[PDB]
């Protein structure tokens, strides 16, 4: 054992308190709950996303810690919030959804054979009822706008259920905290359903972890579930130093405590008393998502595209961005340039991607708005020369 609490390494494991979130969560939770203190309780529609291909951030992890809050805070002033967290990647439909959001619940609301219609009825009527709230977290949001199972008059019946469920007094008792992966979300929705989108109280973007972060997160494992001769700071630097988003990582805090989680049990494989930094640095070494699957063509082409946007350019015709992506490909990445239409598949590649935006009347692109050119760039060449030498 270099362990005292196994269970606060656990993927869904929340600390009892944030320490680098902390402050935007009971303030959050200070928002959901003045709507409740002001009357017209529960209906806000609030959101949380990170950049492109950033995971590990604390989105989950502030929404549960912000939803739990709400509760206590509520609690105090006896009100009663009742907390459902619904993940797309389990939920297909509208009646899973809504299935799995009951049985969080405890209600006796009967669900085997039932109409998703006829259980959303029976929510607002049990709420009202027992004189509860709820507030539900629809995490991996994005993967809802687009799911085919799932319609716009789903999405809006759900997400709009006080406008077509009537509570019998007139109190609206459900809110929504929606997660999703990214700013490209709110364009679907937009899309699909723009009468909640206009109307979304509160769109936080969370960054991606820099060293001092994930430190403090690392360090606040640390005390809470190992022994307290087992570990030292200079440990916890090795992990957080190369994970920082400051110093050229993912700011991911999963990587991070999956890292330390690992060693842990490496020492204890040996029968060791401690952590040794040739342990961590093992497990840092054993341990960009939708541009880490680029073909250096794709990332070649989108690179371009950000220096014209990085250098007065908004929006580049196609033969312009073809000539120099023919230039830069064989005389500055080694590689031989692609024919006509394979080039136009790249460009429709990146646009399905939301990594580029088109405009028909060939074609005109521009940097997808959300990413920042000088930076991703940066990214792009990390990438672009891990292909170019392979
Ligand atoms: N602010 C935080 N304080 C403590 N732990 C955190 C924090 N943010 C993230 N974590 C931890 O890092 C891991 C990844 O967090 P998660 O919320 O799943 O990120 P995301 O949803 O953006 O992928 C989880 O173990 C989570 O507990």
Same mark, same amino acid.
């Given at each position: 054992?270099?362990?005292?609490?196994?269970?606060?390494?656990?993927? #869904?494991?929340?600390?009892?308190?944030?320490?680098?979130?902390?402050?935007?969560?009971?303030?959050?939770?200070?928002?959901?709950?003045?709507?409740?203190?002001?009357?017209?309780?529960?209906?806000?529609? #609030?959101?949380?996303?990170?950049?492109?291909?950033?995971?590990?951030?604390?989105?989950?992890?502030?929404?549960?810690?912000?939803?739990?809050?709400?509760?206590?805070?509520?609690?105090?002033?006896?009100?009663?919030?009742?907390?459902?967290?619904?993940?797309?990647?389990?939920?297909?439909?509208? $009646?899973?959804?809504?299935?799995?959001?009951?049985?969080?619940?405890?209600?006796?609301?009967?669900?085997?054979?039932?109409?998703?219609?006829?259980?959303?009825?029976?929510?607002?009527?049990?709420?009202?009822?027992?004189?509860?709230?709820?507030? *539900?977290?629809?995490?991996?949001?994005?993967?809802?706008?687009?799911?085919?199972?799932?319609?716009?008059?789903?999405?809006?019946?759900?997400?709009?259920? &006080?406008?077509?469920?009537?509570?019998?007094?007139?109190?609206?008792?459900?809110?929504?905290?929606?997660?999703?992966?990214?700013?490209? +979300?709110?364009? $679907?929705?937009? !899309?699909?359903?723009?009468? *909640?989108? /206009?109307?979304?109280?509160?769109?936080?973007?969370?960054?991606?972890?820099?060293?001092? !972060?994930?430190?403090?997160?690392?360090?606040?494992?640390?005390?809470?579930?190992?022994?307290?001769?087992?570990?030292?700071?200079? &440990?916890?630097?090795?992990?957080?130093?190369?994970?920082?988003?400051?110093?050229?990582?993912?700011?991911?805090?999963?990587?991070?405590?999956?890292?330390?989680?690992?060693?842990?049990?490496?020492?204890?494989?040996?029968?060791?008393?401690?952590?040794? !930094?040739?342990? *961590?640095?093992?497990?840092?070494?054993? #341990?960009?998502?939708?541009?880490?699957?680029?073909?250096?063509?794709?990332?070649?082409?989108?690179?371009?595209?950000?220096?014209?946007?990085?250098?007065?350019? !908004?929006?580049?015709?196609?033969?312009?961005?073809?000539?120099?992506?023919?230039?830069?490909?064989?005389?500055?990445?080694?590689?031989?340039?692609?024919?006509?239409?394979?080039?136009?598949?790249?460009?429709?590649?990146?646009?399905?991607?939301?990594?580029?935006?088109?405009?028909?009347?060939?074609?005109?692109?521009?940097?997808?708005?959300?990413?920042? +050119?000088?930076?991703?760039?940066?990214?792009?060449?990390?990438?672009?020369?891990?292909?170019?030498? /392979?």
């Amino acid at each position: 054992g270099l362990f005292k609490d196994r269970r606060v390494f656990d993927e #869904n494991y929340i600390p009892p308190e944030l320490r680098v979130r902390r402050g935007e969560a009971e303030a959050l939770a200070r928002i959901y709950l003045n709507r409740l203190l002001s009357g017209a309780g529960l209906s806000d529609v #609030n959101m949380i996303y990170g950049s492109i291909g950033r995971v590990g951030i604390g989105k989950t992890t502030l929404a549960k810690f912000t939803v739990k809050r709400v509760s206590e805070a509520a609690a105090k002033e006896g009100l009663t919030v009742k907390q459902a967290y619904v993940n797309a990647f389990n939920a297909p439909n509208l $009646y899973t959804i809504l299935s799995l959001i009951v049985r969080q619940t405890g209600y006796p609301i009967q669900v085997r054979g039932a109409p998703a219609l006829d259980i959303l009825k029976a929510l607002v009527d049990n709420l009202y009822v027992e004189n509860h709230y709820l507030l *539900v977290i629809l995490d991996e949001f994005q993967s809802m706008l687009s799911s085919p199972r799932i319609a716009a008059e789903d999405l809006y019946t759900l997400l709009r259920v &006080h406008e077509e469920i009537p509570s019998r007094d007139g109190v609206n008792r459900i809110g929504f905290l929606l997660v999703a992966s990214d700013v490209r +979300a709110l364009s $679907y929705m937009r !899309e699909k359903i723009p009468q *909640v989108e /206009s109307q979304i109280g509160f769109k936080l973007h969370l960054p991606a972890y820099k060293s001092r !972060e994930l430190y403090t997160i690392l360090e606040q494992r640390a005390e809470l579930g190992l022994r307290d001769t087992v570990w030292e700071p200079r &440990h916890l630097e090795l992990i957080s130093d190369v994970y920082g988003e400051d110093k050229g990582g993912d700011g991911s805090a999963r990587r991070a405590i999956v890292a330390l989680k690992m060693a842990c049990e490496m020492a204890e494989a040996m029968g060791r008393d401690s952590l040794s !930094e040739d342990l *961590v640095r093992k497990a840092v070494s054993e #341990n960009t998502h939708e541009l880490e699957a680029l073909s250096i063509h794709e990332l070649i082409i989108l690179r371009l595209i950000a220096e014209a946007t990085l250098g007065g350019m !908004e929006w580049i015709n196609a033969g312009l961005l073809r000539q120099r992506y023919e230039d830069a490909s064989l005389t500055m990445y080694n590689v031989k340039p692609r024919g006509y239409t394979q080039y136009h598949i790249y460009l429709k590649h990146l646009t399905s991607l939301g990594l580029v935006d088109a405009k028909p009347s060939t074609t005109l692109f521009r940097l997808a708005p959300h990413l920042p +050119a000088d930076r991703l760039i940066e990214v792009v060449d990390n990438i672009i020369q891990a292909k170019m030498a /392979s």
